Amino acid sequence: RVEDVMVTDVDTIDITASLEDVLRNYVENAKGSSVVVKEGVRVGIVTTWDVLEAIAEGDDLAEVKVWEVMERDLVTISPRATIKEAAEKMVKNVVWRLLVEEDDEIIGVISATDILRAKM
Numbered sequence: 433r434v435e436d437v438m439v440t441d442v443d444t445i446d447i448t449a450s451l452e453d454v455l456r457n458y459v460e461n462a463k464g465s466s467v468v469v470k471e472g473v474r475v476g477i478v479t480t481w482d483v484l485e486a487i488a489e490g491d492d493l494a495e496v497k498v499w500e501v502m503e504r505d506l507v508t509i510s511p512r513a514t515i516k517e518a519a520e521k522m523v524k525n526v527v528w529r530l531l532v533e534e535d536d537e538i539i540g541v542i543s544a545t546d547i548l549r550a551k552m
């Protein structure tokens with residue numbers, strides 16, 4: 433199940449950060465995503481795909497704040513879901529990562545990389 437393959441040690445970024453920060457975190461530290469935090473509460477996820485979308489639109493990455501592009505509802509899954517169910521949600525929503533929520537709070541992230549490694 434998701435709880436068996438998820439990562440609880442999540443990378444976070446403040447809600448006031450920009451896509452330039454997300455880009456930098458990827459290029460300098462290899463971080464493909466971050467869980468967005470607002471005053472200590474995890475509220476969504478921002479990813480390098482959001483950066484690519486901004487580049488495609490010609491946006492100034494420093495001016496796009498992470499709250500403008502973060503996601504939560506369609507990318508959240510229960511730790512009780514099976515790995516196949518997690519893969520199905522990733523495929524339906526065309527995302528590489530899902531936020532894992534329990535007791536209304538984000539407790540981790542599961543990525544297609546994790547699922548592929550577990551299958552192998």
Ligand SMILES: [Mg+2]
Binds near residue numbers: 503
């Ligand atoms: Mg998106």
